[PDB]
């Protein structure tokens, strides 16, 4: 059905949308942004330690 309609199911881009001075559900949204940044820095720290070397061997 998705290929015949050619339409894709929408993903949640709410984490990009979040804004300051908002309600309790959006307080959950900004803390979600903090956990995503700590994970993103951890994921970037592994790539830096590996170096290109890992892109070289593949």
């Amino acid at each position: 059905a998705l290929y015949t309609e050619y339409l894709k199911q929408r993903n949640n881009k709410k984490r990009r949308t979040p804004d300051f001075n908002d309600d309790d559900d959006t307080l959950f949204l900004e803390e979600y942004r903090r956990k995503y940044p700590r994970i993103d820095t951890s994921r970037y720290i592994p790539n830096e330690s590996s170096e290109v070397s890992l892109l070289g061997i593949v």
């Binding site: 820095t41 830096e48 593949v58």
Partner: protein, 178 residues
């Protein structure tokens, strides 16, 4: 009697003994493991234990050194604190169960205050704005240092991936003609 390099070793051992008495008797919490100075909070908490809270607030401002430091005539303590710890230990199965039951009540109180939150909302987004400043500038530095090195070898990777999709398409028409 002829001492040679012994009074220097004895003065070093006496200085090593005096540093061991000053480091141990400085503070119990500061020496073991891990605050902002606030005289307004000590004035606001006066209205609590209402005598011991002001004794512990002045002890916290003295050990940390809008902040004035006054009395380091408090902590020669090392013999008086040993008698005070041994006298209090004598005054202190049943006691182990009463501490475990009170720890479960405090753990249920810690789980209830966290559940109600999830003023205070403006501080969490500002800590995130500090994180989005720190981590994303660290991300953009780690990306662009990578992208100067990886996007060269991504083109080495992706254009060699494109050689596979033509080697596969030439393989099928040759196997069909074979």
């Amino acid at each position: 009697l002829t001492p040679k390099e012994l009074l220097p070793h004895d003065s070093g051992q006496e200085d090593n003994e005096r540093s061991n008495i000053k480091s141990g008797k400085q503070l119990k919490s500061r020496i073991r493991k891990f605050f902002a100075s606030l005289p307004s909070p000590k004035n606001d908490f006066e209205i609590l234990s209402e005598d011991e809270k002001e004794e512990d607030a002045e002890i916290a401002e003295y050990e940390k050194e809008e902040d004035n430091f006054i009395e380091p005539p408090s902590q020669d303590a090392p013999r008086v604190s040993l008698v005070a710890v041994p006298l209090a230990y004598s005054t202190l199965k049943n006691n182990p169960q009463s501490a475990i039951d009170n720890k479960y009540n405090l753990l249920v109180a810690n789980a209830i205050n966290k559940e109600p939150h999830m003023e205070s909302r403006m501080q969490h987004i500002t800590q995130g704005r500090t994180s989005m400043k720190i981590q994303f500038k660290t991300a953009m530095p780690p990306t662009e240092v990578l992208l100067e090195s990886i996007q060269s070898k991504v083109e080495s990777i992706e254009q060699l991936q494109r050689k596979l999709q033509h080697v596969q398409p030439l393989e099928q028409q040759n196997n069909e003609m074979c």
